[PDB]
Copies of this chain bind each other. A is one copy, B any other.
Amino acid sequence: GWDMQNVITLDTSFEDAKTQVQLKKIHSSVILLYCSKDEAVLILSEARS
């Protein structure tokens, strides 16, 4: 049993209106992230916030 809840692509910037409603959709407890290290820092900071 694999639960592909959603597959989100953060195409735009990581602080604007989009990529905030998208990140709110993650209700699961495990998140597989894939990006560059500099983008990983921003995404994880936003997730912490």
In whole angstroms, how far apart are the Cα atoms of A49 and B21 in the complex? 6
Chain A residues within 8 Å of chain B by Cβ, number: 8
A12 shortest CB reach to chain B, Å? 13
**Interface positions of A from 1 to 49, Cβ below 8 Å from B:** 16-17, 20-21, 24, 27, 48-49
CA distance in complex: A49, B13 (Å): 12
Copy number in the complex reads: 2
- Closest B residue by C-beta to A46: B24
Taking CB as reference atom, which chain B residue is nearest A15?
B49
Minimum CB–CB distance from A7 to chain B (whole Å) comes to 20
Assuming A16-B49, A20-B24, A21-B49, what are 5 further A-B pairs, CB within 8 angstroms?
Answer: A17-B48, A17-B49, A20-B49, A24-B27, A24-B49
